Automatic annotation (TrEMBL), chain A:
Name the UniProt record assigns to this protein: Nuclear receptor coactivator
Location relative to the cell: Nucleus
Known role: Nuclear receptor coactivator that directly binds nuclear receptors and stimulates the transcriptional activities in a hormone-dependent fashion. Involved in the coactivation of different nuclear receptors, such as for steroids (PGR, GR and ER), retinoids (RXRs), thyroid hormone (TRs) and prostanoids (PPARs). Also involved in coactivation mediated by STAT3, STAT5A, STAT5B and STAT6 transcription factors. Displays histone acetyltransferase activity toward H3 and H4; the relevance of such activity remains however unclear.
Family classification: Belongs to the SRC/p160 nuclear receptor coactivator family.
Signal peptide: none
Chain ranges passing through the membrane: none
The organism's taxonomic lineage, starting at the top: Eukaryota, Metazoa, Chordata, Craniata, Vertebrata
Shown segment, full-protein numbering: 745 to 756 of 1399
């Protein structure tokens, strides 16, 4: 699981 | 031979995104100021590395075509390159010009930081070899983009899509080496050859971190995701 990385990539 | 207008545009854009990183002087001032224990140095490393990953993701999303890539491939590229880009940035900082005697103190501070003796020799060998290449800021920025956009990274589904994005960056870098260093005909090849040492650091990153002379190896949740720890 890599939720923080996914969040940083998908934000804005 | 000369950069085309599109290549000049690409290089200026890459350079602006790269300069959003924590300034080298901010990092070296802290290390040179006073001696810290191995415990304090490990916390300094985790805070520096967490900020580096944050800025790295921002730099990565700005690379032409990165956001058009498959979402799983995007994650695989970030995970495959974070440690490598971190060591390249560390090498860049290590080799930045400082006042007389400051570089010796910086090296002495890193040598006694807490890292195991087994990993100091390859780290400093890599830093010194990077230093000998006398790379410009443009070369560090382009080499970082090339490292991030590596098609042969583990778990990549569509390598051709990654290849297509890496190729114009490799082309710009090669032209810069030919224009600014005709006296060193292997400059481009040596920059790329240096990437094999970066891959070795990535292969043993967990062992290097766990061998730090500290009682507890506490990592931030972001570092746990990007690195093979906890
Ligand atoms: O063991 C390491 C490691 C890290 C990640 C994965 C695996 C191993 C490992 C250990 C030191 C250095 C390292 N080489 C440096 C060269 C010059 C200046 C500082 C440097 N550092 C550390 C640092 O802050 N690095 C930043 C640099 C900006 C980008 C994020 C990282 C500090 C940490 C406090 C004590 C002194 C050195 C670099 C790396
Ligand atoms: Cl060449």
């Amino acid at each position: 699981d890599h939720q923080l990385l996914r969040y940083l990539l998908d934000k804005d | 031979m000369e950069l085309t207008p599109d290549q000049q545009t690409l290089l200026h854009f890459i350079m602006d995104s790269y300069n959003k990183q924590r300034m080298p002087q901010e990092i070296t001032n802290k290390i040179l100021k006073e001696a810290f224990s191995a415990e304090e140095n490990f916390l300094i490393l985790t805070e520096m590395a967490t900020n580096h990953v944050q800025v790295l993701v921002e730099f990565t999303k700005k690379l032409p075509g990165f956001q058009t890539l498959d979402h799983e491939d995007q994650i695989a590229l970030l995970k495959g390159s974070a440690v490598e880009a971190m060591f390249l940035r560390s090498a860049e900082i290590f080799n930045k010009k400082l006042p007389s005697g400051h570089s010796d103190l910086l090296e002495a501070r890193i040598r006694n930081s807490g890292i195991s003796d087994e990993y100091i020799t390859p780290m400093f060998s890599f830093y010194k070899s990077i230093g000998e290449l006398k790379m410009t800021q443009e070369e560090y920025a382009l080499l970082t983009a090339i490292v991030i956009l590596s098609p042969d990274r583990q778990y990549i589904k569509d390598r051709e899509a990654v290849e297509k994005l890496q190729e114009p960056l490799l082309d710009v870098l090669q032209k810069l080496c030919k224009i600014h260093q005709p006296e060193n005909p292997q400059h481009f090849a040596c920059l790329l050859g240096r990437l094999t040492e970066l891959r070795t650091f990535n292969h043993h990153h967990a062992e290097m971190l766990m061998s730090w002379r500290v009682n507890d190896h506490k990592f931030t949740p972001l570092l746990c995701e990007i690195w093979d720890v906890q």
